[PDB]
Design a protein around this ligand. Structure first.
Ligand SMILES: OC[C@H]1O[C@H](Oc2c[nH]c3ccc(Br)c(Cl)c23)[C@@H](O)[C@@H](O)[C@@H]1O
Ligand SMILES: OC[C@H]1O[C@H](Oc2c[nH]c3ccc(Br)c(Cl)c23)[C@@H](O)[C@@H](O)[C@@H]1O
Ligand SMILES: OC[C@H]1O[C@H](Oc2c[nH]c3ccc(Br)c(Cl)c23)[C@@H](O)[C@@H](O)[C@@H]1O
Ligand SMILES: OC[C@H]1O[C@H](Oc2c[nH]c3ccc(Br)c(Cl)c23)[C@@H](O)[C@@H](O)[C@@H]1O
Ligand SMILES: [Ca+2]
Ligand SMILES: [Ca+2]
Ligand SMILES: [Ca+2]
Ligand SMILES: [Ca+2]
Ligand SMILES: [Mn+2]
Ligand SMILES: [Mn+2]
Ligand SMILES: [Mn+2]
Ligand SMILES: [Mn+2]
Lengths: 237, 237, 237, 237
């Protein structure tokens, strides 16, 4: 199976798999059962911003999610990703719907990774930033139901012609280049990611959420990973 | 055929194809016959640095090549790359040898491209930096004789076990992700590239040189493009 | 007198000093009489974006001004700033009103300067970005009527309590740190600046405009430089 | 008194003030008595690199110091700098000698700070990088014995004509612009700093060390702060 590290913006409480009984943000290390969560007051129809930050010195993965009205939720977890992830990875965004649904619209996404070696003034780095997505966005690998270009956005899950989100959908977008996320001889390895999103739901309950994730380079959507599994995990272990 | 825009560091004068009778730097637009050149005093065995700069507003492609002793050569050419290149490209480094030879060793390479739209505060961008190259450098596409990892460097052309450059060699390295180099609706499109290199030759005449290039995404080494064609062009038209 | 290099967004045609008979953008080298101008269709009450770009290799100063509806104006001028400016400078924004008036509201401002030496991998650089301005913005030097903090913006010229722009006003904001804009031993010196602005006028004719400028470090508003002199020049020579 | 947060590279063990009995790196919050230290094997005459990293989400200040041979030391400390520092600060480097001495030579220094607001896509940021220091480095405030320009370096403490470090010396260099290090309404505030240094000593014991520090904007060298107080603190409380 794939190796997954993710920050989840989980809009639907699945208590059977350890979700608290409210929308929440979470840090997921090789399991959909978050290692740490925080209560998140998701604002229907508003544009939110998620920031994710990590460095190999502090060994603390942190995320904050905020809206323009100033409300925010944060979660941090002590983890040495050198000991979890493979050296080379791909990075991406994933989202799902299940019985319940929501738009999983990404308006922007940026990422920076740096490896600083012990050799003086020697750094390798990658940075990308998307503030618009075209219909043919060649530097993205789209999986599942994900599409680009609708109003210049990235729609991770299926939306009808009229804008209505569909159930039982899963989609992901991965940056085309592999990323060298750590190296044994690096003195510092760090990364940051930011994305903005618009989650909207008309009926009783948004679901299921959006995640930023880091995976093995050949990661694909696991079979049956719609709904609560967020397009990331093959089961809820 | 491919579409190529390149900055050449040409170490060997091929007067039959318009080279001046001295090593030179040149700007090549869809032809190995440079649109503009400047005399370049290549320092055998020293580490040089090339900087390449362009933006769609000024429409001027510029390059400077320097050594630590302060000697430098510069060349600029007025060109609207919006009207030359396809919208999506790959970027890379290329080098060759022919009857005569040299090491074509790359010690570092960085690149930044930005597309700034008319939509306020909306930019797409890509940046990468290599100061070391590993034996398995997954975010590079190596073509021809190019290898990575020897002393942490990128060797564009063939070098023997003992360090001796070989003749009739061609190799290229392209960044793995396609790059969105221009867009009709962009207000500014800009890019910059820098690389450091060590060209060394023992005998009578180094050849043939190193180039930074931008190509169609599916660009491959043209058949028979060793020596004076720099791994870039199928002929000298 | 000060030494000034500026990009002007000139909203009011003063034909006596060489303005064309329409709003225009211009490149000003040591004189308010622009070396080059382009027609600019200023959109009353809309947020515009100006980008300014220069490098010492190409020796071409360029500016583009755009609005979200896609309309833009561009101007470029060949100039070697190494031969014009002092080595150390301050950078800033300036605006004025005269008999006629407008809001000269700055919503964001960024700047990057880099000096790349002949010594391998040695660069000096400065970058700043403002997307909000507080009432006490300590890293700005405010001159004349300029204020910060009103709706988180920078108001270069005087606006009343009720939002009405006042006539005969001049104000500037300079970044607090001096900037090393060129150096004889640098192989490349480059800078970029971007700012977003909202110019609004109720009556017959907006005036007078906004400029991005680079000056001697001790630059101050010249006496009598309201109106057509843009807070930059002591006279119209 | 000033408010100081610092990372110390402490070359001389002063056990009376809580130093361990070996050279060490330490995190100092409002006291020279480090909150956390780690053993540091200082390599006489070699160029070291210090990286310092912090963000307001994770609330963990980290530092690593390394040499090209791969040896490194790291220290991290949980601290919410929002609750320690004033909103506006200056950042700098400090060093001292006492009865014993060493060169405190800085070869490069970079710093980045970012404030990301809850308003979507609104960030304020400052970045600077020095890889060479001139005799008149106008964007630095030099205090005490600090000088710039000797071999293009920053010498924090006094060195004679012939290169010999002098005792009882203290000097600091602060970036000229104040830095907005936190803001109550910011969702993320982060900073990073890196510097390279060459500490050399001829005799029995190097002393006293180098520190990266963040202070109130009007910070000056406290009276009597040579030697073990590192130019940072007025006493050893
Ligand atoms: O989209 C929200 C959820 O819908 C499904 O689970 C259900 C939530 N409430 C229900 C009520 C009845 C039935 Br049958 C089901 Cl499967 C569910 C499943 O698709 C879940 O994976 C998912 O998280
Ligand atoms: O490496 C330098 C050059 O060597 C070859 O051309 C020759 C340069 N001097 C010669 C002398 C004899 C013969 Br045969 C040849 Cl092909 C050459 C060719 O491989 C050229 O493409 C190349 O630029
Ligand atoms: O604000 C626009 C302009 O107003 C003034 O010039 C005039 C423009 N039309 C006028 C009509 C009458 C008189 Br008196 C004057 Cl000074 C002017 C002056 O303040 C100018 O410097 C300025 O550019
Ligand atoms: O430079 C190293 C140290 O030298 C001085 O302390 C001494 C270290 N060993 C000594 C031996 C004798 C005397 Br007197 C003194 Cl003050 C010292 C003092 O200047 C200290 O602050 C300093 O850390
Ligand atoms: Ca859930
Ligand atoms: Ca040639
Ligand atoms: Ca005018
Ligand atoms: Ca000590
Ligand atoms: Mn969950
Ligand atoms: Mn040539
Ligand atoms: Mn004008
Ligand atoms: Mn100590």
């Amino acid at each position: 199976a794939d190796t997954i590290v993710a920050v989840e913006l989980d809009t639907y409480p699945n208590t059977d798999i350890g979700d608290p009984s409210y929308p929440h943000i979470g840090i997921d290390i090789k399991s959909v059962r978050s290692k740490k969560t925080a209560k998140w007051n998701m604002q229907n129809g508003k544009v939110g911003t998620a920031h994710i930050i990590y460095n190999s010195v502090g060994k603390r993965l942190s995320a904050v999610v905020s809206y323009p009205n100033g409300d925010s939720a944060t979660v941090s977890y002590d983890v040495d990703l050198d000991n979890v992830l493979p050296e080379w990875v791909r990075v991406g965004l994933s989202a799902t719907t299940g019985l319940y649904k929501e738009t999983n619209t990404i308006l922007s996404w940026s990422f920076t990774s740096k490896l600083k070696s012990n050799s003086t003034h020697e750094t390798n780095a990658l940075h990308f930033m998307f503030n618009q997505f075209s219909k043919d966005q060649k530097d993205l690998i789209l999986q599942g139901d994900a599409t680009t270009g609708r109003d210049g956005n990235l729609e991770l899950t299926r939306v009808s012609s009229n804008g209505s989100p569909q159930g039982s959908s899963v989609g992901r977008a991965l940056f085309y280049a592999p990323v060298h996320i750590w190296e044994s001889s690096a003195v510092v390895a760090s990364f940051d990611a930011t994305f903005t999103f618009l989650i909207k739901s008309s009926d009783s309950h948004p679901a299921d959420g959006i995640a930023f994730f880091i995976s093995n380079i050949d990661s694909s959507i696991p079979s049956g990973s719609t709904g609560r599994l967020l397009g990331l995990f093959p089961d809820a272990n």
